[PDB]
């Protein structure tokens, strides 16, 4: 499958693409304002994620640091990123279908649209000003709005027992972005697309 990743933000982001134990394609790249990066993701990929990182410094070896979404200090991510990260999530060719969603379960850093470029399903978006409106206790100093699990590390926020409810914090994310997951057991906002669809992830879509 092909994913076109487009930075419409007025600032540079460092895109990242991983399935948790391996890079997808190159794994990461700098995207200046307006730039597009096309990646190929193997059919059958389960548990893939794409995200943006902000305020990164990398040396000539591809080693460094980002203020949001850092993946062990590498430009080319092999592992998932440090919250807060708005997440585009996908599993491809699962019994003939692709499944896509946006998640705020690991917080929010950059607004995002995740849409198919081929026919047969709709896209999803979270483009509200979550950072501006972020509750004080969830504000990340480096930028972004943390989820409550990351901040407080309780069974209720992290849904550790497999039983948890919505919270004041999850409801904040849900109010601003209804079409994104706000906590682990949120009513699913997953979209079912035809197997082997292609996609575009747009940072700062509006």
Swiss-Prot record:
Keywords, alphabetical: Cytoplasmic vesicle, Disulfide bond, Signal, Taste-modifying protein
Known function: Taste-modifying protein; intensely sweet-tasting. It is 100000 times sweeter than sucrose on a molar basis.
Coarse class of the protein's main subcellular location: cytoplasm
Top-level taxon: Eukaryota
Family named by the database record: Belongs to the thaumatin family.
Protein name in UniProt: Thaumatin I
GO cellular component, one term: cytoplasmic vesicle
Subcellular location: Cytoplasmic vesicle
Disulfide bonds: 9-204, 56-66, 71-77, 121-193, 126-177, 134-145, 149-158, 159-164
Alphabetized Pfam families for the sequence: Thaumatin
Keyword Signal: yes
